[PDB]
Amino acid sequence: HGFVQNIVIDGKNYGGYLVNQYPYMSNPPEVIAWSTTATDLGFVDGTGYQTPDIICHRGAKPGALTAPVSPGGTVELQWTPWPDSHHGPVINYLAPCNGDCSTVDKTQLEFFKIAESGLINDDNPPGIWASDNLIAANNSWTVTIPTTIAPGNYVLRHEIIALHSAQNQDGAQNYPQCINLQVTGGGSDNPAGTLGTALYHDTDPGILINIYQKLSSYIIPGPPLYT
Numbered sequence: 001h002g003f004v005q006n007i008v009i010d011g012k013n014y015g016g017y018l019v020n021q022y023p024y025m026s027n028p029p030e031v032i033a034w035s036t037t038a039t040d041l042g043f044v045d046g047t048g049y050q051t052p053d054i055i056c057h058r059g060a061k062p063g064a065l066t067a068p069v070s071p072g073g074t075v076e077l078q079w080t081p082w083p084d085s086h087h088g089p090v091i092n093y094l095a096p097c098n099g100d101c102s103t104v105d106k107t108q109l110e111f112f113k114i115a116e117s118g119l120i121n122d123d124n125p126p127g128i129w130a131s132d133n134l135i136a137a138n139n140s141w142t143v144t145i146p147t148t149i150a151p152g153n154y155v156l157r158h159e160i161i162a163l164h165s166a167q168n169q170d171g172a173q174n175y176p177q178c179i180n181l182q183v184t185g186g187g188s189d190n191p192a193g194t195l196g197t198a199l200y201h202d203t204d205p206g207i208l209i210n211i212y213q214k215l216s217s218y219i220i221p222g223p224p225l226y227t
């Protein structure tokens with residue numbers, strides 16, 4: 001349980017959507033982060049993989065702002081303190097907005113995977129995962145925007161999937177957090193995208209999994225990594 005509370009883009013701070021506070025106030029600030037209704041600080045499980053909740057979290061609506069990012073610039077997502085028990089991959093996707101990200105219809109967004117990190121070491125199950133790397137790095141993750149993609153407005157969908165209860169169907173816990181970016185650079189690729197409701201199936205081998213054993217491999221879920 002947790003959420004992204006701050007985003008640092010090329011060293012500049014952007015406040016996150018404070019789901020622990022803004023849902024309860026009359027005039028919350030405009031931010032680059034999507035609003036959500038995930039006020040339990042919780043997740044979307046497999047029962048929601050084919051519902052709009054999986055796209056940018058439950059009840060999500062586009063942030064009102066969009067942040068410029070330099071070519072191949074860095075986006076650091078700073079989470080609230082992430083529990084060590086919530087072992088699993090950290091995955092990052094972009095979807096072109098083809099216009100103002102604040103007005104997008106999220107069910108139309110076609111995401112391509114830009115980064116993925118999974119099981120790092122399993123000599124002592126449940127092992128060391130991307131989520132443990134995130135914890136060690138001040139509860140944060142840094143995404144580099146590809147230099148090869150066409151510039152314009154994009155939604156970054158940043159996600160931890162916690163696998164501590166994933167041994168049973170719909171047990172995996174997805175924690176997606178979305179922000180709006182204005183991407184720059186000399187790239188021209190428009191990578192093949194996947195609707196948010198088509199990213200995951202509750203039978204995927206990295207989703208329905210018992211991590212309390214020595215795994216020789218881990219198939220990070222979702223569509224293929226774009227390079």
Ligand SMILES: *[C@@H]1O[C@H](CO)[C@@H](O[C@@H]2O[C@H](CO)[C@@H](O)[C@H](O)[C@H]2NC(C)=O)[C@H](O)[C@H]1NC(C)=O
Pocket residue numbers: 005006013078079080138139
């Ligand atoms: C480690 O993470 C913390 C908390 O997530 C970061 O704290 C934020 O720092 C920015 C920049 O100073 C502030 O504007 C925010 O208000 C802080 N938020 C909280 C909750 O403290 C901290 O900067 C990170 N340390 C780094 C990146 O070295």
Ligand SMILES: [Cu+2]
Pocket residue numbers: 001002042083086
């Ligand atoms: Cu939790």
Ligand code: NA
Pocket residue numbers: 224225226227
């Ligand atoms: Na690739």
